[PDB]
Symmetry: C4
Subunit: 25 residues, 4 copies
């Protein structure tokens, strides 16, 4: 459920925050 779903989405958004640093921004 919902809470768990959201929580994935934060962890997706942490992965993407590292990704965009590794790239030029």
């Amino acid at each position: 459920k919902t809470e768990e779903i959201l929580s994935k989405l934060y962890h997706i958004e942490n992965e993407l925050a590292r990704i965009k640093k590794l790239l030029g921004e």
Copy 2:
């Protein structure tokens, strides 16, 4: 609509950060 809509919006957010990546590359 709640946690549902926050889930929506954060998906869009993710789609937007991905389309920005894709265009950068």
Copy 3:
């Protein structure tokens, strides 16, 4: 809802399929 949520997730997965081609794979 659910269906709409999923559908975002396919469109995330199309963005990522283009991304991984643009990169070395």
Copy 4:
């Protein structure tokens, strides 16, 4: 649990394709 679980699994899928990107870079 249904569409719920498919949503789960495809999140994980996405997290996994992102962690593979992150490690590539």
